[PDB]
Amino acid sequence: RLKVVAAFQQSGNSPMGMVLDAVPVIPPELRPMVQLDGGRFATSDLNDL
Amino acid sequence: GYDTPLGITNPPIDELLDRVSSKYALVIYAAKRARQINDYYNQLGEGILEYVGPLVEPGLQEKPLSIALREIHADLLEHTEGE
Amino acid sequence: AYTLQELLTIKSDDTVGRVKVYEAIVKGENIPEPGIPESFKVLLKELQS
């Protein structure tokens, strides 16, 4: 526990980074969007999530 | 004391090592001079002659690096070590 | 070292690098130093997510 706490203290940061309020999203190309013969959505499910 | 070679192997490697400290320094020590020679050729049309052209008279359309290596063998360049 | 740098950066990924080196070769100008490979920038913009 002392190791973890000392790492926290030396980092100069705060633990509040362990609770998120705004997740980011990667650009659209990284999750490329693909159109099939029928234009179906079959690209990476990142869009699904 | 040996038959004169032909091709890119002239001048030889051992002769150059006698000048430069190590083979790893020589490559840069010659590439920078080749860059300076190419810059001088680029400005040949008009500009300042700060990058003095080839010291040894070149051949018939020889690559600048060959000129740099052939003039380094003549001990006509001075350089500073790392920084 | 420089050969590996070129093989990994200036002839595979860097778009502006490819354009600039091709133009320099077409002209008599020296080849400009490579830039940041697209792989590294993609890795960044993905790990920042």
Side-chain angles (χ1 to χ4, degrees), chain A residues 1-15 18:
Chain A
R1 282 167 39 70
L2 182 60
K3 170 177 65 176
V4 175
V5 172
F8 266 91
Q9 177 274 0
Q10 177 275 359
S11 67
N13 319 330
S14 303
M18 301 201 163

Side-chain angles (χ1 to χ4, degrees), chain B residues 28 34-35 38-39 42, chain C residues 2 28-31 33:
Chain B
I28 295 172
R35 297 271 288 277
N38 191 274
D39 188 323
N42 300 328
Chain C
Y2 294 99
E29 188 176 5
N30 299 324
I31 289 70
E33 66 286 359

Side-chain angles (χ1 to χ4, degrees), chain B residues 24-59:
Chain B
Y24 287 177
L26 165 60
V27 63
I28 295 172
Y29 174 68
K32 295 201 174 302
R33 176 62 193 179
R35 297 271 288 277
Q36 295 183 1
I37 293 170
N38 191 274
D39 188 323
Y40 156 79
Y41 277 2
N42 300 328
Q43 290 179 331
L44 175 55
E46 186 65 10
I48 183 62
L49 189 69
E50 62 192 355
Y51 306 100
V52 297
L55 304 177
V56 176
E57 279 55 7

Side-chain angles (χ1 to χ4, degrees), chain A residues 25-43:
Chain A
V25 314
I26 59 186
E29 299 186 22
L30 279 293
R31 41 178 210 279
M33 50 178 174
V34 67
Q35 311 317 318
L36 274 55
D37 51 349
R40 179 55 209 176
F41 145 73
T43 169

Side-chain angles (χ1 to χ4, degrees), chain C residues 3-41:
Chain C
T3 298
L4 188 63
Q5 184 194 33
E6 294 179 4
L7 295 180
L8 293 177
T9 72
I10 201 172
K11 295 195 297 180
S12 181
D13 299 345
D14 200 357
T15 69
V16 60
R18 289 176 308 187
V19 177
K20 297 294 183 182
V21 67
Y22 180 87
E23 294 301 339
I25 296 170
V26 167
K27 286 181 287 298
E29 188 176 5
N30 299 324
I31 289 70
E33 66 286 359
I36 299 170
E38 286 294 353
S39 183
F40 168 86
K41 194 176 184 183

